[PDB]
Amino acid sequence: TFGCTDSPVRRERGQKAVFCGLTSIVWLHRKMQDAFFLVVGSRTCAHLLQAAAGVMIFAEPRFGTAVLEEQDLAGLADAHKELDREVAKLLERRPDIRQLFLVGSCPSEVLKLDLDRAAERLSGLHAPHVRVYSYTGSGLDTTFTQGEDTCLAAMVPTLDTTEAAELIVVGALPDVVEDQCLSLLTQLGVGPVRMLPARRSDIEPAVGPNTRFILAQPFLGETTGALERRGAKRIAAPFPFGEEGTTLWLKAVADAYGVSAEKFEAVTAAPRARAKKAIAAHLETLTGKSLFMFPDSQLEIPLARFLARECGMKTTEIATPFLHKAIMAPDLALLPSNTALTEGQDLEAQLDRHEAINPDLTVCGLGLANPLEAKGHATKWAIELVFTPVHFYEQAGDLAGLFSRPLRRRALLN
Amino acid sequence: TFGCTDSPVRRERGQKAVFCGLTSIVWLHRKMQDAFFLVVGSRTCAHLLQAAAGVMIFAEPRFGTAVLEEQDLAGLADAHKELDREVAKLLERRPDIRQLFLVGSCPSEVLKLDLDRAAERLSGLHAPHVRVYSYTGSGLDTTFTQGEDTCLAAMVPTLDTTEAAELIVVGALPDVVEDQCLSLLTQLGVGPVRMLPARRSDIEPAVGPNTRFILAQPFLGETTGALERRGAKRIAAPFPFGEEGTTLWLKAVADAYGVSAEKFEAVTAAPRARAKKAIAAHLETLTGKSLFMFPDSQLEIPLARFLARECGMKTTEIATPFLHKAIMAPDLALLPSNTALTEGQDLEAQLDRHEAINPDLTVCGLGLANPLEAKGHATKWAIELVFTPVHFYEQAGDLAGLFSRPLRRRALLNG
Amino acid sequence: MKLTLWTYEGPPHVGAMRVATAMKDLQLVLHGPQGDTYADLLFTMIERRNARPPVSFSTFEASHMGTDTAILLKDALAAAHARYKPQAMAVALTCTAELLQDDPNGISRALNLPVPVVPLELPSYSRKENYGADETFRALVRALAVPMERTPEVTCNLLGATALGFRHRDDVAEVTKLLATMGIKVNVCAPLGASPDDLRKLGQAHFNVLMYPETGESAARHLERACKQPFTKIVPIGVGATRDFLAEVSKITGLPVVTDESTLRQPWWSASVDSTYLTGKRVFIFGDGTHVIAAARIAAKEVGFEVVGMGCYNREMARPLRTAAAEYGLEALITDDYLEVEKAIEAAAPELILGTQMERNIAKKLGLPCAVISAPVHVQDFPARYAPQMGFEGANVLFDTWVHPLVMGLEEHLLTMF
Amino acid sequence: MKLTLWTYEGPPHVGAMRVATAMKDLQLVLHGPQGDTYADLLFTMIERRNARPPVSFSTFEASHMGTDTAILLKDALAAAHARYKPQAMAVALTCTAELLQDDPNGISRALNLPVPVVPLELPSYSRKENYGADETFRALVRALAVPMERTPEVTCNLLGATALGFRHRDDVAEVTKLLATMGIKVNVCAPLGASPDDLRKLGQAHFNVLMYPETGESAARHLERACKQPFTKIVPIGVGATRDFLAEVSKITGLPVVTDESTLRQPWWSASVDSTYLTGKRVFIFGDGTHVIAAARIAAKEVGFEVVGMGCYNREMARPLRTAAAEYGLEALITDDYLEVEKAIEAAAPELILGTQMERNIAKKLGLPCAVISAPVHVQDFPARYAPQMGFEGANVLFDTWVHPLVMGLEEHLLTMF
Ligand code: PMR
Ligand code: PMR
Ligand code: SF4
Ligand code: SF4
């Protein structure tokens, strides 16, 4: 009745309608104050970033694209020299940049520009004031949120060493969410706890053989691997979405740090009740409604789990761009047994399945949202789940509200 | 060729298209910082003030209307204890007001509300923090700028007495204009000098048998009379419009205070050449152009004089709501002798004369402007002349520009 | 006495002026002091009309009071007629002339002009602008309108459009289109565009479209008695209300409702995911009764706002507003006092204000988004461009207008988690 | 490498999508990576479309590169034809696919589909969006348009209107009205609303109306050679340019110019006394060549502004702009670099900016009034309401639009002396 542990997931390739990992810069540059994100790509990549950024593009943001010119398209050694000239020119103008990320794209990768080596040589040149990294955000390699994962993983080898037994919470979270997380954990008697990424380059967490980490976000497979390579040990947990997800997440940390059951219960009791109450306000519209999720971000399984178990929704097909088995285990074990799971996408085939199901609410991207609405399908646009505070207790009702809203609007307008 | 001293002026009456003196509150309240202007009138009077004030009405202005209700019209209705209630309530929440003006309107006057009596009663009740005055701004009594005159005149009997021989410059001028005037007179060695009205209620000028005053605005006949009753003597002068107007006005003060010719010419030479050069930028468009002025404000004669003498314009009919002969004598002596002068108005007859003249530029109100534009007549809307710094040397170019602008727009838009 | 800074409506004689100025070949003569011509500027400047309003004042002042005031009125009536040769005239008192004892009816009858002079009774101390317009138009229709045989084809009159009416120009154009698509032509649009002789031919229409109850209600009721003409009770502002209006017209005439919806874009704009952030946004609504009632329905049922306040300044529309407000679980705010509107807005803490030019400024003061839905209005809300509030294009216009002041989805999401 | 934050135009394949999405019954297949479908959102979100664009991508990714990429393009063409049964298809390369060795022409010929598959040459590292659309439409006209008999009635084609075009929807409607008044009907409007079959019958039109040079100039020049059809050189934005356009059309057809100006209000609005304070307002103008040339004439000759800067981001319009700018005594600013636009604005210190969405944001930082006259543009500039830039209603819309951000005459006089 509950448990998708052994559910056969449909793995699917074909036409896809997803974002590349470049899009991660849009939220990363806001969290990471000392950082600049320089894409090496074409006008296409620049055009994506500006359309994605919206009003952000006019807010003097800490990102840009070194757009490939015709002369850059042949002769690898010359292209590397041009990149260095372009970086030297940017850095010379911008003393405030302490972290520079060289971001890989489809054009740079087909050109086989070794940005990993460029980062290595640029770090050596511009040390100690500017550390430069390299990671891929290309559509060939990443989908949407995986851009955060490749970014954070690039920082890990370079983090300071320590023998301290500290906690690292991994994932870029809204400041309010991050603050609540630190508070709850401090109340539980666990510390010091640091965040990856930090808000500044001079306060990144150190890592060593006694470090524990826990993922706040499901899409962090590479970063997990890199942390494990440094000796860090992961705390397995469902993702902190809703009252139940948050409790189970904090409980895993508590159990790992030997926190008493009485202490856990006393710190967690009030915020738990407040979360369940906030959610209850959205139960009437949400309960019994069929849910369908197109793949976008890897938040699908944890959010499907939250919506079924806490909001009474019925799952139909729940699709994800990538499913990390070990990381997704705790959530899969709670996901209702009926759920049809998909990894990847064959767009037209998936759209045919969608129409046959005729789901009450469809989570999908902005390329699908309006066309689906026009066909009489109520939608919930997927990007909002990455651009709203949605983790932990205080945001549990707001999260439910994100899904009740489009159904309430539909009813309101007819 | 110049001089309209003995020109017959047409005294015309009938339908008029002019503002009542209530409209003067719109600029008066900005100048007089600790004053409040309370019209006793109808919704018509509040409607006018709101329309006139535009953006100002939303800036919590220092004016209002005690609007008469049906109950206030009755022969047993104590509208005076109603009015006292109204001002007590107004002053209760407004300790910033040191001067309250009870402004008469057509309804208050036809009803025969004694606002003068009310002002004395109420200033006794609210002494020494607020002095309350009474004047008429009604359409029955006053036209447009004459409301400034009736306001200032009401303040005069109340001014401190002095034996001092000081100068009062009369007329509410923009701050920048007032500072320039004050600077030039200080440079000439004349002083000390004060403005009526002052910026605040505690620095109003004193008046006495040795006081001199000069008018900066032509519409100040009643204030002139009131000051002369306190024993003060006027300095006659053309109005300080343009380079020539301003020199003559300054020279009159210079001559009055025994200022030498050497010092006058030295203080005055640089500002003068600067003004004359600023005017020349507008000469090509303005020269030879015929001018017609409808009556609105009493600035018509002095502005017509400036446009003919300094801008090469040709007068046709120049009309004014009121022509104070003594005050306007200097400007009239300088007006081109061909000028047809009119005091008052019969709107349809005056529009008929306008039509037959077919003048190049017509100064008129906002009620006539667009209608006249639609008949092919280039207009210069008259209100702007009270709502722009136009007096003295520094603004002489800007003043010429007010008149060249509509002619240049017409050319720019018709090829 | 009432301490007054802002007034939503002028005196009733201004309403008379906007019936006269709406019409052609009619001269209105107001018994009034010199100075009251300030109202002409409303028409020449705000509506930017290219001609002087067909209105003149007797222009009494201090030197011609007493027995002269009655003579000045006589002369004004005589001179207006000789010069302009109108098909009919109207005579009325200004607020100051109401305190006098001159009789415009007796004065006008003794003059014995070859055309009708219609005397108007406008109580200036108890009534306001909208009543002035409604009563002037009614008095003129009762003087001129006459029973006639119906037009061979189905026709209606349009009633209530005036000079200085908020979007009256384009509402007339848009409503005419709505009716033409159903095979219904307009007989007379009145007062706007109509002459006294057009008012004489009002009775040959099959029914009346009551465009604006505040300026057409009384004439609509008279024409129902005199000419046995039904008039529409639904004002076609909003998609729903436009549909109900057409169903109403259909019942009156027996003609099927036909629509051209090829450029109706508001429903899809509102249904698109771009608009989901608009759900439950708290809106305060103020203005005249007609426009407030219409706006609340669009807000709640078409755009998906939560209506959190509803009121009007004209208590002539208080009954239907109270009835409308109750549908939203709200008590109607009936007041002409802007300070009381300001208090109600602050108490309701809305995210959007729909109202008058006064509410535009209250909204500025409070740092709140605002759109104009109703007179009183400034020059900008008399646009050069096609800008109806009525019908299907009006729904398009209203959608764009209301969402404009609101920061957009993306911006909202950046101003919370960053 | 060229450091880029803001880009005025996207890549050429987005221009191809603008043509394909404008059309009906045409499937575009783009050889491109997973992720490039972001451009779909331009049409679904900004232009607010109710269907998926008729554009599919081969969707190659790291695990399926090499000899698979060619297979993927083949499968994408086959699948798009089998599912949608279009009348024709187009195939092009994304920027990334340009770096690959796959031959779209060779692959499509080896599939041997029942319909034409038109290969497109879009150089993504040297050219941009507008060229992509201009070229795509040209290639389609080259493939489909044939010599024909002329229609018995005088008809024309409208050329250059696309999806994601700034006021293309309403410009099309307004230009159509202008032509109908002269007795000229539209044969085919293309690309917007046209099917591949409509393009086959382009030849029967007497002449072509080039609505937008940046997106239709090449197809206009081809049709002059192939179908002997003259095309109009004057773009009807502004009263004067509309009159010049109508006289131009008059020479082509021999038909006299007939105008309906019953609703043309901009000239009177501009002539009215309310507008006198607009004289000499210093205006800086930026955007695409067409809209900047048109705006400068209105600014100077119709509104009375002084034009203090003129520029465009699209080098295809550099010469016509230089020519136009010299008439104002100006050097045209030719740049795609918003930082250069910002500097030129700062040096000119204008009182008003007419530009794109970027200029609106430059103006905000500088605290300057700004109105939008050209793409790139946000969702608000794709309105529900009627909002042409062309013809007589366009002139109305443009007058209201440009004057709105400016502080009014009265408020100006309050600066100032108080
Ligand atoms: C790259 C294409 C693209 C386009 C054309 C839009 C339009 C648009 N995106 Mg945006 N958006 C694009 C992409 C993205 N958006 C993103 C974010 C975003 C948010 C959070 C939101 C949004 C929105 C929009 C909107 C609505 C208007 C606006 O709020 O600016 C457009 C036209 C807006 C909305 O109402 O969605 C339903 C909203 O809340 N976008 C992100 C996050 C990385 C991306 C990549
Ligand atoms: C009493 C009626 C009335 C009306 C309806 C308007 C409208 C109007 N007055 Mg105003 N104006 C009125 C009167 C007055 N105006 C006054 C002032 C004034 C100025 C300085 C200006 C102005 C103007 C206007 C305008 C134009 C729009 C605006 O500036 O707000 C309207 C509609 C405006 C203009 O462009 O005039 C050509 C301008 O610069 N008014 C004054 C000074 C006491 C009065 C009495
Ligand atoms: S003319 Fe008389 S009634 Fe009219 S606004 Fe002026 S004071 Fe009031
Ligand atoms: S990285 Fe690849 S998928 Fe993303 S915008 Fe650039 S070319 Fe497109």
Side-chain angles (χ1 to χ4, degrees), chain B residues 231-263:
Chain B
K233 187 184 190 196
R234 208 180 95 241
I235 312 176
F239 292 90
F241 295 117
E243 182 273 294
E244 180 185 36
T246 308
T247 304
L248 267 9
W249 191 96
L250 261 13
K251 181 67 177 174
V253 182
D255 289 348
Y257 279 79
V259 177
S260 57
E262 270 93 333
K263 204 181 198 217

CSV table of all heavy atoms in Angstrom, one decimal, chain B residues 231-263:
chain,number,residue,atom,x,y,z
B,231,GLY,N,0.0,105.6,6.2
B,231,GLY,CA,0.9,106.7,6.0
B,231,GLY,C,2.1,106.4,5.0
B,231,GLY,O,2.9,107.3,4.8
B,232,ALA,N,2.1,105.2,4.5
B,232,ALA,CA,3.2,104.8,3.6
B,232,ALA,C,3.0,105.4,2.2
B,232,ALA,O,1.9,105.6,1.7
B,232,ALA,CB,3.2,103.2,3.5
B,233,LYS,N,4.2,105.6,1.6
B,233,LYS,CA,4.2,106.3,0.2
B,233,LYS,C,4.7,105.3,-0.9
B,233,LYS,O,5.7,104.7,-0.7
B,233,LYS,CB,5.0,107.6,0.3
B,233,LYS,CG,4.9,108.4,-1.0
B,233,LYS,CD,5.9,109.6,-0.9
B,233,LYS,CE,5.6,110.5,-2.1
B,233,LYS,NZ,6.7,111.5,-2.3
B,234,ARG,N,3.9,105.3,-2.0
B,234,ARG,CA,4.3,104.5,-3.1
B,234,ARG,C,5.4,105.0,-4.0
B,234,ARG,O,5.4,106.2,-4.2
B,234,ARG,CB,3.0,104.1,-3.9
B,234,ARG,CG,3.2,102.8,-4.6
B,234,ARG,CD,2.0,102.5,-5.5
B,234,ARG,NE,2.1,102.8,-6.9
B,234,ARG,CZ,1.4,103.7,-7.5
B,234,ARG,NH1,0.4,104.3,-6.8
B,234,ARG,NH2,1.6,104.0,-8.8
B,235,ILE,N,6.2,104.1,-4.5
B,235,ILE,CA,7.1,104.5,-5.6
B,235,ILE,C,6.5,104.0,-6.9
B,235,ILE,O,6.4,102.8,-7.1
B,235,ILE,CB,8.5,103.8,-5.4
B,235,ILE,CG1,9.0,104.0,-3.9
B,235,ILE,CG2,9.5,104.3,-6.4
B,235,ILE,CD1,10.3,103.3,-3.6
B,236,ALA,N,6.1,104.9,-7.8
B,236,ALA,CA,5.5,104.6,-9.1
B,236,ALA,C,6.6,104.0,-10.0
B,236,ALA,O,7.8,104.5,-10.0
B,236,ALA,CB,4.9,105.9,-9.7
B,237,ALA,N,6.3,103.0,-10.8
B,237,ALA,CA,7.2,102.3,-11.7
B,237,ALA,C,6.5,101.4,-12.6
B,237,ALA,O,5.4,100.9,-12.3
B,237,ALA,CB,8.2,101.5,-10.8
B,238,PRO,N,7.0,101.3,-13.9
B,238,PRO,CA,6.6,100.2,-14.8
B,238,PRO,C,6.9,98.9,-14.1
B,238,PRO,O,7.8,98.8,-13.3
B,238,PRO,CB,7.5,100.4,-16.0
B,238,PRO,CG,8.0,101.8,-15.9
B,238,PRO,CD,8.1,102.1,-14.5
B,239,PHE,N,6.2,97.8,-14.5
B,239,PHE,CA,6.4,96.6,-13.8
B,239,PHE,C,7.6,95.8,-14.3
B,239,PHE,O,8.0,96.0,-15.4
B,239,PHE,CB,5.1,95.7,-13.8
B,239,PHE,CG,4.0,96.3,-12.9
B,239,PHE,CD1,3.1,97.3,-13.4
B,239,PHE,CD2,4.1,96.1,-11.5
B,239,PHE,CE1,2.2,97.9,-12.6
B,239,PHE,CE2,3.1,96.7,-10.7
B,239,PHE,CZ,2.2,97.6,-11.2
B,240,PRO,N,8.3,95.1,-13.4
B,240,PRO,CA,9.6,94.6,-13.6
B,240,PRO,C,9.5,93.3,-14.6
B,240,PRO,O,9.8,92.2,-14.1
B,240,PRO,CB,10.2,94.2,-12.2
B,240,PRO,CG,9.0,94.0,-11.4
B,240,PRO,CD,7.8,94.8,-12.0
B,241,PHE,N,9.1,93.6,-15.8
B,241,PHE,CA,9.1,92.6,-16.8
B,241,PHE,C,10.0,92.9,-17.9
B,241,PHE,O,9.9,94.0,-18.5
B,241,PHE,CB,7.6,92.4,-17.4
B,241,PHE,CG,6.6,92.0,-16.4
B,241,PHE,CD1,5.6,92.8,-16.0
B,241,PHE,CD2,6.8,90.7,-15.9
B,241,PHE,CE1,4.7,92.3,-15.1
B,241,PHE,CE2,5.9,90.2,-14.9
B,241,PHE,CZ,4.8,91.0,-14.5
B,242,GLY,N,11.0,92.0,-18.2
B,242,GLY,CA,12.0,92.2,-19.2
B,242,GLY,C,13.1,93.1,-18.7
B,242,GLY,O,13.2,93.5,-17.6
B,243,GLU,N,14.1,93.3,-19.6
B,243,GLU,CA,15.3,94.1,-19.2
B,243,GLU,C,14.9,95.6,-18.9
B,243,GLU,O,15.4,96.2,-18.0
B,243,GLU,CB,16.3,94.0,-20.4
B,243,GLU,CG,17.6,94.8,-20.1
B,243,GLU,CD,17.5,96.2,-20.5
B,243,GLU,OE1,17.5,96.5,-21.7
B,243,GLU,OE2,17.6,97.1,-19.6
B,244,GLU,N,14.0,96.2,-19.8
B,244,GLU,CA,13.7,97.6,-19.7
B,244,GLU,C,12.7,97.8,-18.5
B,244,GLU,O,13.0,98.6,-17.6
B,244,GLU,CB,13.0,98.1,-20.9
B,244,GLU,CG,12.6,99.6,-20.9
B,244,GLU,CD,11.9,100.0,-22.1
B,244,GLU,OE1,11.1,99.3,-22.7
B,244,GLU,OE2,12.1,101.2,-22.6
B,245,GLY,N,11.7,97.0,-18.4
B,245,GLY,CA,10.8,97.0,-17.3
B,245,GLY,C,11.5,96.9,-15.9
B,245,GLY,O,11.3,97.7,-15.0
B,246,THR,N,12.4,95.9,-15.8
B,246,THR,CA,13.2,95.7,-14.6
B,246,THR,C,14.1,96.9,-14.3
B,246,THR,O,14.2,97.3,-13.1
B,246,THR,CB,14.0,94.4,-14.7
B,246,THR,OG1,13.1,93.3,-15.0
B,246,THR,CG2,14.7,94.1,-13.3
B,247,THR,N,14.8,97.5,-15.3
B,247,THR,CA,15.7,98.6,-15.1
B,247,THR,C,14.9,99.8,-14.6
B,247,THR,O,15.2,100.4,-13.5
B,247,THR,CB,16.5,99.0,-16.4
B,247,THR,OG1,17.2,97.9,-16.8
B,247,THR,CG2,17.4,100.2,-16.1
B,248,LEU,N,13.8,100.2,-15.3
B,248,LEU,CA,12.9,101.3,-14.8
B,248,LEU,C,12.3,101.1,-13.4
B,248,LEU,O,12.3,102.1,-12.7
B,248,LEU,CB,11.7,101.4,-15.8
B,248,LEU,CG,11.9,102.4,-17.0
B,248,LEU,CD1,13.3,103.1,-17.2
B,248,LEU,CD2,11.4,101.8,-18.3
B,249,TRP,N,12.0,99.9,-13.0
B,249,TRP,CA,11.5,99.6,-11.7
B,249,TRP,C,12.6,99.8,-10.7
B,249,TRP,O,12.4,100.4,-9.6
B,249,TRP,CB,11.0,98.1,-11.7
B,249,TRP,CG,10.2,97.7,-10.5
B,249,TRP,CD1,8.8,97.7,-10.3
B,249,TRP,CD2,10.7,97.1,-9.3
B,249,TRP,NE1,8.4,97.1,-9.1
B,249,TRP,CE2,9.6,96.8,-8.4
B,249,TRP,CE3,12.0,96.8,-8.8
B,249,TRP,CZ2,9.7,96.2,-7.2
B,249,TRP,CZ3,12.1,96.2,-7.5
B,249,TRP,CH2,11.0,95.9,-6.7
B,250,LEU,N,13.8,99.3,-11.0
B,250,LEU,CA,15.0,99.4,-10.1
B,250,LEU,C,15.4,100.9,-10.0
B,250,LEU,O,15.7,101.3,-8.9
B,250,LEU,CB,16.1,98.6,-10.6
B,250,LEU,CG,16.4,97.2,-10.0
B,250,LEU,CD1,15.3,96.6,-9.1
B,250,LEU,CD2,16.8,96.2,-11.1
B,251,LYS,N,15.4,101.6,-11.1
B,251,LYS,CA,15.8,103.0,-11.2
B,251,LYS,C,14.9,103.9,-10.3
B,251,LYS,O,15.4,104.8,-9.7
B,251,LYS,CB,15.8,103.4,-12.7
B,251,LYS,CG,16.2,104.9,-12.9
B,251,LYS,CD,17.6,105.2,-12.5
B,251,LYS,CE,18.0,106.7,-12.9
B,251,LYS,NZ,19.4,107.0,-12.4
B,252,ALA,N,13.6,103.6,-10.3
B,252,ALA,CA,12.6,104.3,-9.5
B,252,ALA,C,12.9,104.2,-8.0
B,252,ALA,O,12.9,105.1,-7.3
B,252,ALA,CB,11.2,103.8,-9.8
B,253,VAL,N,13.3,102.9,-7.6
B,253,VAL,CA,13.7,102.7,-6.2
B,253,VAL,C,15.1,103.4,-6.0
B,253,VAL,O,15.3,104.0,-4.9
B,253,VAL,CB,13.9,101.2,-5.9
B,253,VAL,CG1,14.3,100.9,-4.5
B,253,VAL,CG2,12.6,100.4,-6.2
B,254,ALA,N,16.0,103.3,-6.9
B,254,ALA,CA,17.3,103.9,-6.8
B,254,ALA,C,17.2,105.4,-6.6
B,254,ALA,O,17.8,106.0,-5.7
B,254,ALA,CB,18.2,103.6,-8.1
B,255,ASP,N,16.4,106.1,-7.5
B,255,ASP,CA,16.1,107.5,-7.4
B,255,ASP,C,15.5,107.9,-6.1
B,255,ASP,O,15.7,108.9,-5.5
B,255,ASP,CB,15.2,108.0,-8.5
B,255,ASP,CG,16.0,108.0,-9.9
B,255,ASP,OD1,17.2,107.9,-9.9
B,255,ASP,OD2,15.3,108.1,-10.9
B,256,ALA,N,14.6,107.0,-5.6
B,256,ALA,CA,13.9,107.2,-4.3
B,256,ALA,C,14.8,107.3,-3.1
B,256,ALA,O,14.6,108.1,-2.2
B,256,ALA,CB,12.8,106.2,-4.1
B,257,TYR,N,15.8,106.4,-3.1
B,257,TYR,CA,16.7,106.3,-2.0
B,257,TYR,C,18.1,107.0,-2.1
B,257,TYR,O,19.0,106.9,-1.3
B,257,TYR,CB,17.0,104.8,-1.7
B,257,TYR,CG,15.8,104.2,-0.9
B,257,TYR,CD1,14.6,103.8,-1.5
B,257,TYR,CD2,15.9,104.1,0.5
B,257,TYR,CE1,13.6,103.3,-0.7
B,257,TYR,CE2,14.9,103.6,1.3
B,257,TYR,CZ,13.7,103.2,0.6
B,257,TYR,OH,12.7,102.7,1.4
B,258,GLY,N,18.1,107.9,-3.1
B,258,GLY,CA,19.3,108.8,-3.3
B,258,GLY,C,20.5,108.0,-3.8
B,258,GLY,O,21.7,108.4,-3.5
B,259,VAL,N,20.3,106.9,-4.4
B,259,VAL,CA,21.4,106.1,-5.0
B,259,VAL,C,21.9,106.8,-6.2
B,259,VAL,O,21.2,107.3,-7.1
B,259,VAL,CB,20.8,104.6,-5.4
B,259,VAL,CG1,21.9,103.8,-6.1
B,259,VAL,CG2,20.3,103.9,-4.2
B,260,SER,N,23.2,106.9,-6.3
B,260,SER,CA,23.9,107.6,-7.4
B,260,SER,C,23.8,106.8,-8.7
B,260,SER,O,23.6,105.6,-8.7
B,260,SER,CB,25.4,107.8,-7.0
B,260,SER,OG,26.0,106.6,-6.7
B,261,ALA,N,24.0,107.6,-9.8
B,261,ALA,CA,24.0,107.0,-11.2
B,261,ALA,C,25.1,106.0,-11.4
B,261,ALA,O,24.9,105.0,-12.1
B,261,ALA,CB,24.0,108.1,-12.2
B,262,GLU,N,26.3,106.3,-10.9
B,262,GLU,CA,27.5,105.4,-11.0
B,262,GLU,C,27.2,104.0,-10.4
B,262,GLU,O,27.5,103.0,-11.0
B,262,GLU,CB,28.7,106.0,-10.3
B,262,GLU,CG,29.6,106.9,-11.2
B,262,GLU,CD,29.2,108.3,-11.1
B,262,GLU,OE1,28.0,108.7,-10.9
B,262,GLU,OE2,30.1,109.2,-11.4
B,263,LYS,N,26.6,104.0,-9.2
B,263,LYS,CA,26.3,102.7,-8.5
B,263,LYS,C,25.2,101.9,-9.2
B,263,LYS,O,25.3,100.7,-9.2
B,263,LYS,CB,26.1,102.9,-7.0
B,263,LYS,CG,26.4,101.6,-6.2
B,263,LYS,CD,26.1,101.8,-4.7
B,263,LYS,CE,26.9,100.7,-3.9
B,263,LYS,NZ,26.1,100.2,-2.8
